[PDB]
Amino acid sequence: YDDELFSDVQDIKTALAKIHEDNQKIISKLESIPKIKGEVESIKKQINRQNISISTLEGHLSS
């Protein structure tokens, strides 16, 4: 096991450890994606109820 190859293998291991670390940082930042999807689907639902309220107001005014 040559010292230089040993040193380069340790460099490869260090690089791999940094990539793994960065992947978990990525997975953490992706934790709020299902929160956003949920909130967006809730907004859509609230807007639909609102469209109905405005349509009811349109009816009650046309009298």
Site string for a copy of itself, 2-41 (x = CB under 8 A): x-xxx-xx-xxx-xxxxxx-xxxxxx-xx-xxxxxx-xxx
- Residues near a copy of itself (CB under 8 A), total: 51
22 known member of a binding site: no
* CA neighbor of 22 nearest in space, from 34, 14, 10: 14
* Residue type at 54 in one-letter notation: I
Note the Cα 42 to chain centre separation in Å. 16
Residues after which a C–N gap over 2.5 Å breaks the chain: none
Tell me which residues touch a copy of itself (CB under 8 A).
Answer: 1-2, 4-6, 8-9, 11-13, 15-20, 22-27, 29-30, 32-37, 39-44, 46-51, 53-58, 60-62
Write out the binding residues for Ca(2+): 8
